[PDB]
Structures are given as C-alpha cells and as structure tokens.
Design a protein around this ligand. Structure first.
Ligand SMILES: CC(=O)N[C@@H]1[C@@H](O)[C@H](O[C@@H]2O[C@H](CO)[C@@H](O[C@@H]3O[C@H](CO)[C@@H](O[C@@H]4O[C@H](CO)[C@@H](O)[C@H](O)[C@H]4NC(C)=O)[C@H](O)[C@H]3NC(C)=O)[C@H](O)[C@H]2NC(C)=O)[C@@H](CO)O[C@H]1O
Ligand SMILES: [Cl-]
Ligand SMILES: [Cl-]
Ligand SMILES: [Cl-]
Ligand SMILES: [Cl-]
Ligand code: NA
Length: 129
C-alpha cells in the first residue's frame, strides 16, 4: 500500500506515535517519506547482509527475523514480512521499541539526514487529525 501523507499521519497518530518518546508526528511522517516513500512494501538490502523492511525501513540485523541475516537479533519478535503489511500496527509497535533503545530517531538514517532539525510540522499541513 502506498499511503497518502495525511492518511499515514492519521494512522500513526491513532497508533500513538505522535510525540512518542518526544517526537512529534511530523518527524514520523518525514521519516516514512524518505525511508519508504510511504510504501508499505518497500525493502532494501544493506551491505552487512541485513534488509530494511516496510514503511519505516526496519532492519533485520536488530529488529525482525527474515531467516537470512545470520548472527542477527529479532528484538521486536516478529517476522520481517509482517512489517510489509498494509496495516502499519506491527511497524509502529516495533518503531516504538527502536526509538526507545538509546539513540532516539537517529536510528533512521534518512530522518537524521533529511528531517532532523527541519520544519517537520509541514509534513502534517492540511491534515485534519
Ligand atoms: C548503510 C546504512 O547506514 N544503512 C542503514 C541501516 O543501517 C539502517 O537500519 C538501521 O541499522 C542500524 C545499523 O545496524 C541500526 O543502528 C543500530 O541500532 C542498535 C539497536 O538500537 C544500536 O545499539 C544500541 O546502541 C545504544 C547506544 O549505544 C545502546 O544503548 C543499546 O543498548 C544498543 N542496543 C542493542 C540491542 O545492543 C546501535 O548502536 C546502532 N548502530 C548504529 C551505527 O547506529 C538501526 O537500529 C537501524 N534502524 C532501523 C530503523 O532498523 C536503515 C534504517 O532504515 O537505513 C539504512 O540506510
Ligand atoms: Cl508527500
Ligand atoms: Cl536470520
Ligand atoms: Cl539519508
Ligand atoms: Cl509535527
Ligand atoms: Na534478525
């Protein structure tokens, strides 16, 4: 599924991501935009053999099991394919664990390089919410 911008904002807010660990909703929408272009089916391979999955590009080295990232963790206790669902529940629940693990949203490289410090509230402009 390719979410619309306000559609994703609403879903993220409903699932409790707005101001989760102090990160306002626009931060999360911006992160999803540049991680996946709002596409729940996005996958990308990393150089260490891991893969990033879904709307928030969650990485199999740490967070989910894909069966082909040897020596990795599965800290969200979920198959990585569950992070590709049209329903973002699993991705949000896992993202909450990620952003709580010490580095905040710096876990998302696209957030750090493209969202951090910018006018992220613009990402929810026009949305009812
Ligand atoms: C080439 C490139 O940059 N590719 C990007 C992917 O790397 C990235 O997916 C992210 O992958 C990184 C690197 O593996 C990962 O970051 C690591 O996360 C772990 C777990 O949180 C950190 O370990 C914690 O460190 C803190 C602070 O020291 C400790 O307090 C805590 O105890 C540690 N936790 C554990 C379980 O040991 C690593 O420090 C951290 N490493 C680095 C270098 O930052 C991110 O979590 C991955 N992000 C996501 C969302 O999964 C991917 C993101 O979409 O983007 C690629 O481009
Ligand atoms: Cl957009
Ligand atoms: Cl594995
Ligand atoms: Cl980047
Ligand atoms: Cl915001
Ligand atoms: Na894994």
């Amino acid at each position: 599924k390719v979410f619309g911008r306000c559609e994703l904002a609403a879903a993220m807010k409903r699932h409790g991501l707005d101001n989760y660990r102090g990160y306002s909703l626009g931060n999360w929408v911006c992160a999803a935009k540049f991680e996946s272009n709002f596409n729940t089916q996005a996958t990308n391979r990393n150089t260490d053999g891991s893969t990033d999955y879904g709307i928030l590009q969650i990485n199999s080295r740490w967070w989910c099991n894909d069966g082909r990232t040897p020596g990795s963790r599965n800290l969200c206790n979920i198959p990585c394919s569950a992070l590709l669902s049209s329903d973002i529940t699993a991705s949000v629940n896992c993202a909450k664990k990620i952003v709580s693990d010490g580095n905040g949203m710096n876990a998302w490289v696209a957030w750090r390089n493209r969202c951090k410090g910018t006018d992220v509230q613009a990402w929810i402009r026009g949305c009812r919410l």
